[PDB]
Structure 1
Amino acid sequence: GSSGSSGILLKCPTDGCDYSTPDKYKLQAHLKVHTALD
């Protein structure tokens, strides 16, 4: 399981969402912006 580039823009999985960041952690947090409700 090679990686090569070892770093690419992660496009949010959420359908429609156009959020992408070179950071993995940051993304994980963003994925919460959708499933976030009081």
Structure 2
Amino acid sequence: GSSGSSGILLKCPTDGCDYSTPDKYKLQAHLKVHTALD
């Protein structure tokens, strides 16, 4: 990665995952990738 102006990062709680985002609702929309599949 690299440095720059952004918010505080939130992280995925799931085992073997590496995802992070500055938004709480983008994170909830990512938790659906582990709790459901289509």
Give TM-score, length-normalised by structure 2: 0.69
Unmatched 5+ stretches in structure 1: none
Q: CA RMSD in A?
A: 6.6
Aligned to 1:24: 24
Relative to structure 1, the CA distance from residue 36 to residue 2 in structure 2 (aligned partners, 3 Å threshold; closer, same or farther) is: same
- Runs of at least 4 residues off by over 3 Å: 1-7
Total equivalences in the alignment:
38
Unmatched 5+ stretches in structure 2: none
Give TM-score, length-normalised by structure 1: 0.69
| Percentage of pairs with the same residue | 100
Give the C-alpha shift of residue 2 in structure 1.
28
